[PDB]
Coordinates of C-alpha atoms in Angstrom, one line a residue:
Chain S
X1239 CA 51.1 37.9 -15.8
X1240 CA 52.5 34.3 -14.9
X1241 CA 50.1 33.9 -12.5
X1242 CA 47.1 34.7 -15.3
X1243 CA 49.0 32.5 -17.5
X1244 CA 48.9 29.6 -14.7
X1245 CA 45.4 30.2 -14.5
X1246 CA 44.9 30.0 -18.0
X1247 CA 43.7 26.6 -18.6
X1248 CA 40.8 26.6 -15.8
X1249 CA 39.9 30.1 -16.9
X1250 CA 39.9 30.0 -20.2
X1251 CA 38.4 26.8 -20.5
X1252 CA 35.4 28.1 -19.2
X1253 CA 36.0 31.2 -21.3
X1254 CA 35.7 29.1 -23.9
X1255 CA 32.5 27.4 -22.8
X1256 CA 31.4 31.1 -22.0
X1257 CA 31.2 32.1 -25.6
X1258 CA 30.0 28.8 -26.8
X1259 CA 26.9 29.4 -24.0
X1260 CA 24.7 30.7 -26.5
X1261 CA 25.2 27.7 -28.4
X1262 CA 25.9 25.6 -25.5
X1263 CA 23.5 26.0 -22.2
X1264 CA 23.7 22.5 -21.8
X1265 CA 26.0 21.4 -19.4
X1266 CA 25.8 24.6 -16.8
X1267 CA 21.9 24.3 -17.1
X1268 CA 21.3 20.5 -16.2
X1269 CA 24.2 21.3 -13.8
X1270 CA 22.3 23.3 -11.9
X1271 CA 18.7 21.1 -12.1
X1272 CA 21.0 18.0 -10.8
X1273 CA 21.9 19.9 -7.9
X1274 CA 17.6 20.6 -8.1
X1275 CA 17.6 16.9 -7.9
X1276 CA 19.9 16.7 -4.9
X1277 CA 18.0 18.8 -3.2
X1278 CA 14.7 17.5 -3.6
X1279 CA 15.6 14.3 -3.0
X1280 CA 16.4 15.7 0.7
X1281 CA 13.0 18.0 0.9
X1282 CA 11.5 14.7 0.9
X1283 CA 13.5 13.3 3.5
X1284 CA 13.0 16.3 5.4
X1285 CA 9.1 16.1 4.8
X1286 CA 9.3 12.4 5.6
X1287 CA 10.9 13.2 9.6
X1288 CA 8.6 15.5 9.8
X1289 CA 5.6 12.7 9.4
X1290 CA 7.5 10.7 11.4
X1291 CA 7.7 13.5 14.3
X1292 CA 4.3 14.9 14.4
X1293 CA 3.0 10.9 14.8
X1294 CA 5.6 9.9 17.2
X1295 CA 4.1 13.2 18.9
X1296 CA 1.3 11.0 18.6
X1297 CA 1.8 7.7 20.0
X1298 CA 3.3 9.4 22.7
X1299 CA -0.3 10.9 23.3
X1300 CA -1.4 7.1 22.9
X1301 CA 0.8 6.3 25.7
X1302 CA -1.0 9.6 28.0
X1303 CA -4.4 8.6 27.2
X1304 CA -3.7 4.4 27.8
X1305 CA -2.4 6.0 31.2
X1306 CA -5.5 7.8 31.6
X1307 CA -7.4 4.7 30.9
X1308 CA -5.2 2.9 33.6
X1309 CA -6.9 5.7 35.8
X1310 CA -10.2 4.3 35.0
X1311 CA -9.7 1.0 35.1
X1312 CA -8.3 2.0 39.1
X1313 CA -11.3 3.8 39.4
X1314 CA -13.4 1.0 38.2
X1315 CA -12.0 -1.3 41.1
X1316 CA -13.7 1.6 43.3
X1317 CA -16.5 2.5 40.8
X1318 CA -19.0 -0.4 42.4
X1319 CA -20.3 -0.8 46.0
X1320 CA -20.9 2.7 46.3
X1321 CA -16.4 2.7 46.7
X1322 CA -15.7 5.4 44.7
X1323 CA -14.3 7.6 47.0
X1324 CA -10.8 6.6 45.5
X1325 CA -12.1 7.3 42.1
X1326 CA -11.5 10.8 43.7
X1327 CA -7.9 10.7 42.8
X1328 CA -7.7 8.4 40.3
X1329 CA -9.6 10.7 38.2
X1330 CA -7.8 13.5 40.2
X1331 CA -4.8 12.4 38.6
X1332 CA -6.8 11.7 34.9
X1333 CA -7.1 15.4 34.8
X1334 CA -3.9 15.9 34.5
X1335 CA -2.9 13.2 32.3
X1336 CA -6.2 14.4 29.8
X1337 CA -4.6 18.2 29.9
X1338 CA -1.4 16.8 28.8
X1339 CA -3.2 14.4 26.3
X1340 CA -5.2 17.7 24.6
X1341 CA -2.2 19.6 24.7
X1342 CA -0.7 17.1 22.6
X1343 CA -3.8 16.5 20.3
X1344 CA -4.1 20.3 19.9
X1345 CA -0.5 20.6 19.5
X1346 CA -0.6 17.7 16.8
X1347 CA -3.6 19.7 15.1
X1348 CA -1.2 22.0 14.0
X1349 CA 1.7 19.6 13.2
X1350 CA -1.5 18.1 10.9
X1351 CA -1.7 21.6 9.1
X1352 CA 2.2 21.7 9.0
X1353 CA 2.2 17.7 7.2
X1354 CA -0.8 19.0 4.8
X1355 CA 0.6 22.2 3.9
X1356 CA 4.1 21.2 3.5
X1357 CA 2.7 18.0 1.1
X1358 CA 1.0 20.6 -0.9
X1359 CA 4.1 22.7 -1.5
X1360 CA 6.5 19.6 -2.5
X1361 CA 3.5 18.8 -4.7
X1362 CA 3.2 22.2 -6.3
X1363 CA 7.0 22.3 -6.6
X1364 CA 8.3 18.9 -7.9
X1365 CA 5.7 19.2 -10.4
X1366 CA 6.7 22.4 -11.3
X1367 CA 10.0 20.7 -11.3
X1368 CA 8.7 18.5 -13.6
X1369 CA 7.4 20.7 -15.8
X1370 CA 10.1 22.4 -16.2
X1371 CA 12.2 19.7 -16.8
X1372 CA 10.3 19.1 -19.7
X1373 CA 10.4 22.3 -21.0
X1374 CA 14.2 22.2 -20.8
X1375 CA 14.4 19.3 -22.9
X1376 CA 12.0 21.2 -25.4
X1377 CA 14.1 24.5 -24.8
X1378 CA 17.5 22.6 -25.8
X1379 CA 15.9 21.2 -28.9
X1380 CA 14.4 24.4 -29.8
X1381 CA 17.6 26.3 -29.7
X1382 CA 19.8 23.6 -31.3
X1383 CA 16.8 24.2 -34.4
X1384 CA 17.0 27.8 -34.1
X1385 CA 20.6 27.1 -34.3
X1386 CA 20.6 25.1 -37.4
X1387 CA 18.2 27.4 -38.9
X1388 CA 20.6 30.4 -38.6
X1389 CA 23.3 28.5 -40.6
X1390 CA 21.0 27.4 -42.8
X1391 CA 20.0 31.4 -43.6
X1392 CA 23.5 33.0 -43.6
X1393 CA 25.2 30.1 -45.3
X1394 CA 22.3 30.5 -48.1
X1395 CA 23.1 34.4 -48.1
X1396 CA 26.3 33.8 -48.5
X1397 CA 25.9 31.3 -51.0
X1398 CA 23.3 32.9 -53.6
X1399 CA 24.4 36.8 -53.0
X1400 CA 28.6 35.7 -52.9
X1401 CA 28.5 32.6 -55.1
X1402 CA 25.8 32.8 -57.7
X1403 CA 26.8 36.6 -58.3
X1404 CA 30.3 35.8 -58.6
X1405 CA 28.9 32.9 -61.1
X1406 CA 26.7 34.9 -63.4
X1407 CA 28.6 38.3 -63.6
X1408 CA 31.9 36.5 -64.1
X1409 CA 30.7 34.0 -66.5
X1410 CA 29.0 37.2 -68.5
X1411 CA 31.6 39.1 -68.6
X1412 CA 33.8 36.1 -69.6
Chain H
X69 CA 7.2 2.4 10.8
X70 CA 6.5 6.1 10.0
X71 CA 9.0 6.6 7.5
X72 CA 7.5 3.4 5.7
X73 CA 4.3 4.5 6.3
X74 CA 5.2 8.1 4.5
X75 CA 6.0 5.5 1.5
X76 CA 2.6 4.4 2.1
X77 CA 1.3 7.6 1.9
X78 CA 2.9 8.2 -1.7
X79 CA 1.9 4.6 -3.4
X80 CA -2.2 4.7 -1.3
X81 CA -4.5 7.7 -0.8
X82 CA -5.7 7.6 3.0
X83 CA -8.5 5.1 3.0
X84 CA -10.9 7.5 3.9
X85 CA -14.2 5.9 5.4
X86 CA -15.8 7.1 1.6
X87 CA -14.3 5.2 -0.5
X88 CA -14.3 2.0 2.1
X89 CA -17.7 2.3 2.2
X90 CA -18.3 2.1 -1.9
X91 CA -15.9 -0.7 -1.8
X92 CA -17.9 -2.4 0.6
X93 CA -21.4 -1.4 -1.6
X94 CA -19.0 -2.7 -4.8
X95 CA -19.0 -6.6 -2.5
X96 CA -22.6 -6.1 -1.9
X97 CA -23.6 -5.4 -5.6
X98 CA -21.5 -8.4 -6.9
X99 CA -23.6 -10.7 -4.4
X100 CA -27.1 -9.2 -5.6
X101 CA -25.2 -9.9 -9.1
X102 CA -25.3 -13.7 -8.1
X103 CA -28.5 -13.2 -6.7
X104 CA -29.5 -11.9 -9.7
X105 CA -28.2 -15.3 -11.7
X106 CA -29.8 -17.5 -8.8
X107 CA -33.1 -16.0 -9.4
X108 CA -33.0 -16.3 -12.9
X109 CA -32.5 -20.0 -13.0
X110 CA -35.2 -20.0 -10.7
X111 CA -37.4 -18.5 -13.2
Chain V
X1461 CA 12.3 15.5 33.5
X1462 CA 9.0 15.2 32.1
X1463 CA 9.8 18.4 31.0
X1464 CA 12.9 17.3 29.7
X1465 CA 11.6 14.2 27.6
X1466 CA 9.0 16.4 26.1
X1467 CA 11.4 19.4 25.3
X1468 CA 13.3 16.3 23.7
X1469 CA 10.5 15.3 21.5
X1470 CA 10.1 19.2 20.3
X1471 CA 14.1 19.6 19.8
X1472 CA 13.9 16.4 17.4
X1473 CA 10.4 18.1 15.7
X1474 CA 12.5 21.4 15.8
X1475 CA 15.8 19.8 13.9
X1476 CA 13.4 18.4 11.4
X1477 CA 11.4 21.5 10.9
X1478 CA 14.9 23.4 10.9
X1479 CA 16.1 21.1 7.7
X1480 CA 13.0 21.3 6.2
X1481 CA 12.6 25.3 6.1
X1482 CA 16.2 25.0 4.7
X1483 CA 15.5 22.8 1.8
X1484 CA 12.0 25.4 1.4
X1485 CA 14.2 27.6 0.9
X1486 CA 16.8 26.4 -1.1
X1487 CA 13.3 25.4 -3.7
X1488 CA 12.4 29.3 -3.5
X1489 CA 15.7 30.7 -4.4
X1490 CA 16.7 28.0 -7.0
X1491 CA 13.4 28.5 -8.2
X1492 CA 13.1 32.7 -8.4
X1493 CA 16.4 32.0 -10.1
X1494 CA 15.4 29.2 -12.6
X1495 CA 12.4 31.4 -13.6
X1496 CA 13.4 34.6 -13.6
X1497 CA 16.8 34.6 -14.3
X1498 CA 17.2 31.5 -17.0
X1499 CA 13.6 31.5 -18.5
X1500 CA 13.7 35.2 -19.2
X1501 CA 17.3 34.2 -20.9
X1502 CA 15.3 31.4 -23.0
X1503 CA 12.5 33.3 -24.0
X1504 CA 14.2 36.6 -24.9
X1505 CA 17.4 35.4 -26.3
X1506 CA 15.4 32.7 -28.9
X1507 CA 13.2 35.4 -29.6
X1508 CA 15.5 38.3 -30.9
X1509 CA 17.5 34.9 -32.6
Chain F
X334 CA -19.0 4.5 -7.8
X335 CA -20.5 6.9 -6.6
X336 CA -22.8 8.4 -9.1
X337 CA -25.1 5.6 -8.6
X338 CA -28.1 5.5 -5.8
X339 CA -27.7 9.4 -5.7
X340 CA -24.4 8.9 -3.5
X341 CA -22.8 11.8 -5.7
X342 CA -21.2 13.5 -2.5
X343 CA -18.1 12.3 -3.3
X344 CA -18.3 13.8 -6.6
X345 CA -17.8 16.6 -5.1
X346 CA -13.7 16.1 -4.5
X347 CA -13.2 13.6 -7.2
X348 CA -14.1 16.2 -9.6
X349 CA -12.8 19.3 -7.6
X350 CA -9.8 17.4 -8.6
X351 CA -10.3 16.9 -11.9
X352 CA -11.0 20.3 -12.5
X353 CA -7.2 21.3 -11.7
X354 CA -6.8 18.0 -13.7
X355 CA -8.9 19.5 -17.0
X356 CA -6.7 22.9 -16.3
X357 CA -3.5 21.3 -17.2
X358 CA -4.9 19.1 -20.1
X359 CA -5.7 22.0 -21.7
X360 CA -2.8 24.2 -20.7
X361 CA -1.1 20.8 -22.2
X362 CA -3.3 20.6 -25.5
X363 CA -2.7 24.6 -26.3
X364 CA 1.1 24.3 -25.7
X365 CA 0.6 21.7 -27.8
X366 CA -1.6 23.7 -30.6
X367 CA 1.2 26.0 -30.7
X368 CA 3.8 22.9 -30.6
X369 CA 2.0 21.8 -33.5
X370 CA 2.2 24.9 -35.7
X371 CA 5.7 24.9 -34.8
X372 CA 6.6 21.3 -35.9
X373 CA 4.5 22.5 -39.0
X374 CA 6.3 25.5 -39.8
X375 CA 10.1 24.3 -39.6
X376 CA 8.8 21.0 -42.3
X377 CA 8.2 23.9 -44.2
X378 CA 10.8 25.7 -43.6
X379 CA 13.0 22.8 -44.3
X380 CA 11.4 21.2 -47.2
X381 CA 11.3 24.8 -49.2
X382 CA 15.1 25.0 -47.5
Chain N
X1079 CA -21.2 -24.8 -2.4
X1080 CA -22.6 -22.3 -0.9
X1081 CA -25.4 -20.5 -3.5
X1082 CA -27.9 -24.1 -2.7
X1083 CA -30.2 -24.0 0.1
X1084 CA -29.9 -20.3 1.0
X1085 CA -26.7 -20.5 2.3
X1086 CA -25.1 -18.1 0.1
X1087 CA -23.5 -16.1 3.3
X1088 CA -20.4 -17.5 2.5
X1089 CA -20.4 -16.0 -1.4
X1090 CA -20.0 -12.5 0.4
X1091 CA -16.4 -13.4 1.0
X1092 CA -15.8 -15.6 -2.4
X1093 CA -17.4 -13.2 -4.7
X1094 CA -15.3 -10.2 -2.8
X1095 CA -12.4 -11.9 -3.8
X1096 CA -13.5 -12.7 -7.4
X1097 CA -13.9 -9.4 -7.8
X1098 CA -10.6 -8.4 -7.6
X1099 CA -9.4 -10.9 -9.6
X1100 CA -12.0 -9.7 -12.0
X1101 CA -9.9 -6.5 -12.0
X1102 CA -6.6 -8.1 -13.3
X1103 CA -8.1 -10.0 -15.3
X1104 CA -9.8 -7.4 -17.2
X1105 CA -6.5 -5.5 -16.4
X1106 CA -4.8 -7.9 -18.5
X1107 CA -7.3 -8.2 -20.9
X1108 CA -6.7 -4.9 -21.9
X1109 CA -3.3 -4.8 -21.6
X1110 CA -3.6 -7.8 -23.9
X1111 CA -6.0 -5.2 -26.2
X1112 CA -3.1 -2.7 -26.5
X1113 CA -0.1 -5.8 -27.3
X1114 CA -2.8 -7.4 -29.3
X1115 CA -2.6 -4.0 -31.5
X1116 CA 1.4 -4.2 -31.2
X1117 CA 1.7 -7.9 -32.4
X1118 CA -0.9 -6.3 -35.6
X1119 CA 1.2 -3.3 -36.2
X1120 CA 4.5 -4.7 -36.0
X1121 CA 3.5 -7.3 -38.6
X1122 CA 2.3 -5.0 -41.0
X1123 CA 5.6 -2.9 -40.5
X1124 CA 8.0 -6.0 -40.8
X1125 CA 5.9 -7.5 -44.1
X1126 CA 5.8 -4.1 -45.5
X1127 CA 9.3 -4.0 -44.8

């Protein structure tokens, strides 16, 4: 077909690399960790807004709880002399900012857990990752010995069972 | 700050009150060491 | 609006955890795949080599 | 610094760590024993070669 | 100036920084322990070579 024939040079240049793949991993396999890389280099980005969230989160709670100590420091105007009876909704108002604060504390218990866990898995992984990466390098020079090894056993058959039979029967009979 | 402070997190474990408090035993040790010296010129 | 601002600070936390189970996943996958499909291809094909 | 004065408590995480820490030394070492036979094989292998 | 008369209050703060800089120094010092065996080695290798 024309088309195949079009084709041909991005196809079969592969093809090419396709049967070489036993000899030649290389190239698809680091390929395929680089994009690893790429990615991991977002997770962390990723894991770093998250931080950045759950303590904004945070000093957003600072902000309920300075208001809250705004309430007492109202009340505490009224909190000598016997006065207190606006502390009645000063701290009337406190209660709600304190529910809001422990909803946010509670809330940022979890995004804690979230933070910790999430640190633990990178950890676990990129290690992994790293790991692996050295095993790759070891798995690359492992098979380019195997490799060599294999040549060094069939061009040896070839060369005593071929060579040095062709050598002593023919120089015999000669 | 928090994204810097995740940096911070990578290069420094969280300074824990623990290990603050042996580093403030480690000041307090090197001062006894002096002492130590003091005393000993005393002698 | 209070409402509002805070439903703002959990769509920002929810856009980050969003990206972040994303890239979680893309480590699983690339990773069932990295193990299971090349390392059984390394440790098989080198040992019938 | 803190095995001194009977302060060991931290002990407890510093080597809860180093336990995982010892676990991969070893996993390390005995990749490594089998590294080695394998470094000694192929010089024989070659040198006999 | 301080460690006369009883007034050592002030080597809390002096020796707390000494230490640190007890801990480059010794740092260095063995840092200087390893490239003191690399200056050793390396002459050997060139005068053998």
């Amino acid at each position: 077909m024309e088309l195949f024939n079009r084709v041909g040079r991005v196809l079969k240049s592969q093809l090419t690399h396709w049967q070489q793949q036993q000899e030649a991993p290389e190239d698809l396999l680091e390929r395929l960790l680089g994009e690893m890389e790429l990615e991991l280099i977002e997770l962390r980005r990723a894991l770093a807004q998250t931080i950045a969230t759950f303590k904004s989160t945070e000093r957003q709670r600072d902000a309920q709880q300075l208001i809250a100590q705004r309430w007492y420091e109202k009340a505490q105007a009224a909190l000598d002399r016997g006065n207190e009876q606006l502390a009645r909704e000063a701290l009337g108002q406190r209660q709600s900012y304190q529910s809001h604060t422990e909803a946010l504390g509670k809330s940022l218990g979890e995004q804690r857990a979230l933070v910790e866990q999430v640190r633990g898995q990178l950890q676990k992984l990129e290690r992994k990752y790293l790991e692996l990466k050295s095993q790759k390098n070891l798995y690359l020079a492992r098979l380019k010995s195997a490799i060599a090894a294999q040549k060094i056993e069939e061009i040896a058959g070839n060369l005593d069972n071929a060579s040095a039979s062709s050598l002593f029967e023919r120089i015999e009979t000669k | 700050i928090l994204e810097l402070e995740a940096e911070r997190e990578l290069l420094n474990p969280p300074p824990s009150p623990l290990d603050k408090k042996f580093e403030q035993w480690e000041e307090q040790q090197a001062v006894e060491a002096t002492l130590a010296a003091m005393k000993a010129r005393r002698s």
